[PDB]
Write a protein that holds these residues in place. Structure first.
Motif, PDB file in Angstrom:
ATOM      1  N   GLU A  55       0.832  -1.195   0.000  1.00 45.96           N
ATOM      2  CA  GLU A  55       0.000   0.000   0.000  1.00 45.96           C
ATOM      3  C   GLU A  55       0.870   1.249   0.000  1.00 45.96           C
ATOM      4  N   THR A  56       0.790   2.010  -1.083  1.00 50.16           N
ATOM      5  CA  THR A  56       1.616   3.190  -1.261  1.00 50.16           C
ATOM      6  C   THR A  56       1.116   4.334  -0.399  1.00 50.16           C
ATOM      7  N   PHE A  57       1.965   5.348  -0.261  1.00 48.38           N
ATOM      8  CA  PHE A  57       1.541   6.655   0.212  1.00 48.38           C
ATOM      9  C   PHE A  57       2.443   7.701  -0.427  1.00 48.38           C
ATOM     10  N   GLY A  58       2.216   8.954  -0.050  1.00 49.75           N
ATOM     11  CA  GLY A  58       2.776  10.069  -0.779  1.00 49.75           C
ATOM     12  C   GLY A  58       1.987  10.452  -2.005  1.00 49.75           C
ATOM     13  N   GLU A  59       0.737  10.000  -2.115  1.00 47.49           N
ATOM     14  CA  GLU A  59      -0.066  10.255  -3.302  1.00 47.49           C
ATOM     15  C   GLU A  59      -0.753  11.611  -3.253  1.00 47.49           C
ATOM     16  N   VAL A  60      -0.520  12.387  -2.196  1.00 47.23           N
ATOM     17  CA  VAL A  60      -0.946  13.779  -2.196  1.00 47.23           C
ATOM     18  C   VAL A  60      -0.148  14.565  -3.229  1.00 47.23           C
ATOM     19  N   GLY A  61       1.172  14.596  -3.078  1.00 45.03           N
ATOM     20  CA  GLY A  61       2.018  15.343  -3.989  1.00 45.03           C
ATOM     21  C   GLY A  61       2.274  14.686  -5.333  1.00 45.03           C
ATOM     22  N   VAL A  62       1.212  14.229  -5.996  1.00 46.19           N
ATOM     23  CA  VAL A  62       1.330  13.758  -7.369  1.00 46.19           C
ATOM     24  C   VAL A  62       1.288  14.946  -8.304  1.00 46.19           C
ATOM     25  N   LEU A  63       0.178  15.682  -8.256  1.00 43.18           N
ATOM     26  CA  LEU A  63       0.018  16.942  -8.958  1.00 43.18           C
ATOM     27  C   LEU A  63      -0.545  18.035  -8.063  1.00 43.18           C
ATOM     28  N   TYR A  64      -0.958  17.697  -6.838  1.00 40.79           N
ATOM     29  CA  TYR A  64      -1.554  18.665  -5.923  1.00 40.79           C
ATOM     30  C   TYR A  64      -0.522  19.620  -5.348  1.00 40.79           C
ATOM     31  N   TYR A  65       0.745  19.186  -5.282  1.00 41.72           N
ATOM     32  CA  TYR A  65       1.912  20.026  -4.971  1.00 41.72           C
ATOM     33  C   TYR A  65       1.808  20.610  -3.565  1.00 41.72           C
ATOM     34  N   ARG A  66       1.170  19.857  -2.680  1.00 44.94           N
ATOM     35  CA  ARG A  66       0.748  20.286  -1.365  1.00 44.94           C
ATOM     36  C   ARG A  66       1.466  19.463  -0.300  1.00 44.94           C
ATOM     37  N   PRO A  67       1.659  19.995   0.909  1.00 49.26           N
ATOM     38  CA  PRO A  67       2.386  19.240   1.933  1.00 49.26           C
ATOM     39  C   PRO A  67       1.600  18.051   2.468  1.00 49.26           C
ATOM     40  N   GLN A  68       2.359  17.108   3.024  1.00 48.11           N
ATOM     41  CA  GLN A  68       1.829  15.849   3.522  1.00 48.11           C
ATOM     42  C   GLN A  68       1.004  16.082   4.782  1.00 48.11           C
ATOM     43  N   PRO A  69      -0.085  15.334   4.959  1.00 45.63           N
ATOM     44  CA  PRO A  69      -0.967  15.583   6.107  1.00 45.63           C
ATOM     45  C   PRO A  69      -0.395  15.120   7.433  1.00 45.63           C
ATOM     46  N   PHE A  70       0.185  13.929   7.460  1.00 42.49           N
ATOM     47  CA  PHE A  70       0.437  13.217   8.701  1.00 42.49           C
ATOM     48  C   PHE A  70       1.923  13.206   9.012  1.00 42.49           C
ATOM     49  N   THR A  71       2.257  12.562  10.119  1.00 43.78           N
ATOM     50  CA  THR A  71       3.623  12.151  10.387  1.00 43.78           C
ATOM     51  C   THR A  71       3.772  10.677  10.036  1.00 43.78           C
ATOM     52  N   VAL A  72       4.994  10.274   9.692  1.00 38.52           N
ATOM     53  CA  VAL A  72       5.267   8.906   9.249  1.00 38.52           C
ATOM     54  C   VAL A  72       6.453   8.386  10.052  1.00 38.52           C
ATOM     55  N   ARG A  73       6.174   7.564  11.061  1.00 36.19           N
ATOM     56  CA  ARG A  73       7.200   6.932  11.878  1.00 36.19           C
ATOM     57  C   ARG A  73       7.096   5.422  11.744  1.00 36.19           C
ATOM     58  N   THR A  74       8.241   4.781  11.561  1.00 36.95           N
ATOM     59  CA  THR A  74       8.315   3.351  11.331  1.00 36.95           C
ATOM     60  C   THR A  74       8.084   2.643  12.657  1.00 36.95           C
ATOM     61  N   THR A  75       7.661   1.380  12.612  1.00 31.28           N
ATOM     62  CA  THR A  75       7.588   0.594  13.836  1.00 31.28           C
ATOM     63  C   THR A  75       8.576  -0.564  13.827  1.00 31.28           C
ATOM     64  N   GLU A  76       8.471  -1.447  12.845  1.00 29.57           N
ATOM     65  CA  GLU A  76       9.501  -2.419  12.528  1.00 29.57           C
ATOM     66  C   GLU A  76      10.061  -2.058  11.160  1.00 29.57           C
ATOM     67  N   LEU A  77      11.324  -2.425  10.929  1.00 33.78           N
ATOM     68  CA  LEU A  77      12.094  -1.967   9.775  1.00 33.78           C
ATOM     69  C   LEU A  77      11.437  -2.354   8.457  1.00 33.78           C
ATOM     70  N   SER A  78      11.751  -1.598   7.413  1.00 39.29           N
ATOM     71  CA  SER A  78      11.022  -1.718   6.167  1.00 39.29           C
ATOM     72  C   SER A  78      11.945  -1.508   4.985  1.00 39.29           C
ATOM     73  N   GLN A  79      11.424  -1.832   3.807  1.00 32.69           N
ATOM     74  CA  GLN A  79      12.091  -1.574   2.542  1.00 32.69           C
ATOM     75  C   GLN A  79      11.144  -0.733   1.703  1.00 32.69           C
ATOM     76  N   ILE A  80      11.569   0.477   1.364  1.00 36.20           N
ATOM     77  CA  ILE A  80      10.692   1.481   0.788  1.00 36.20           C
ATOM     78  C   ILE A  80      11.272   1.940  -0.543  1.00 36.20           C
ATOM     79  N   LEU A  81      10.529   1.715  -1.621  1.00 41.58           N
ATOM     80  CA  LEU A  81      10.907   2.224  -2.931  1.00 41.58           C
ATOM     81  C   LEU A  81      10.728   3.735  -2.953  1.00 41.58           C
ATOM     82  N   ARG A  82      11.377   4.397  -3.909  1.00 43.97           N
ATOM     83  CA  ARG A  82      11.255   5.851  -4.013  1.00 43.97           C
ATOM     84  C   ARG A  82      11.282   6.287  -5.473  1.00 43.97           C
ATOM     85  N   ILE A  83      10.101   6.546  -6.028  1.00 47.66           N
ATOM     86  CA  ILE A  83       9.952   7.218  -7.313  1.00 47.66           C
ATOM     87  C   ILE A  83       9.667   8.678  -6.989  1.00 47.66           C
TER      88      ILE A  83
END
Lengths: 88, 88
Positions: free
Chosen positions: B32-60
């Motif tokens: 399940e992706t996120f960061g889909e606010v700033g696709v074309l809306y060009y607006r700041p992110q709503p929430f805070t994003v803190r990890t709980t257990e470690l992850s592997q996160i792609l970045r386009i």
């Protein structure tokens, strides 16, 4: 393409031109717009458009639409209506 | 905003920052992706994003998306998925 043609009254009959010698299909009724190909697709019109009984046709042309483009944050609803419109 | 963050694994916990002292809600699961606010809306992110257990996160990232914009006639499907995605 050059302009949108919203009907306000009057019947419209569309028939195949060049590719089709006769018959085929084409229609639009009071209130039902056409010219919605050249919104952003910038592509030529599919059919021929010949009137049957006289009509009153509004014209919001291509440059007027593209001038209306900068008034954003409500063109998203128009483009969603385009995508859900043509996919059905 | 700067980049899309597709999860590939690992839990994510989102909590209100500054406006909310504690609790609130925020979530994303494997795939399940996120960061889909700033696709074309060009607006700041709503929430805070803190990890709980470690992850592997792609970045386009943002400039990579806008470089992918010129490959059109299939961005219409992406934008329809955006509009039907957020309206529901």
């Amino acid at each position: 393409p050059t302009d949108l043609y919203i009907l306000v009254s009057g019947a419209v009959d569309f028939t195949v031109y060049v590719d089709g010698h006769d018959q085929f299909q084409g229609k639009a009724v009071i209130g039902e717009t056409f010219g919605e190909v050249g919104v952003l697709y910038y592509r030529p019109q599919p059919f021929t458009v010949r009137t049957t009984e006289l009509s009153q046709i509004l014209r919001i042309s291509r440059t007027s639409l593209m001038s209306a483009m900068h008034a954003h944050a409500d063109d998203g609803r128009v483009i969603m209506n385009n995508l859900f419109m043509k996919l059905r």
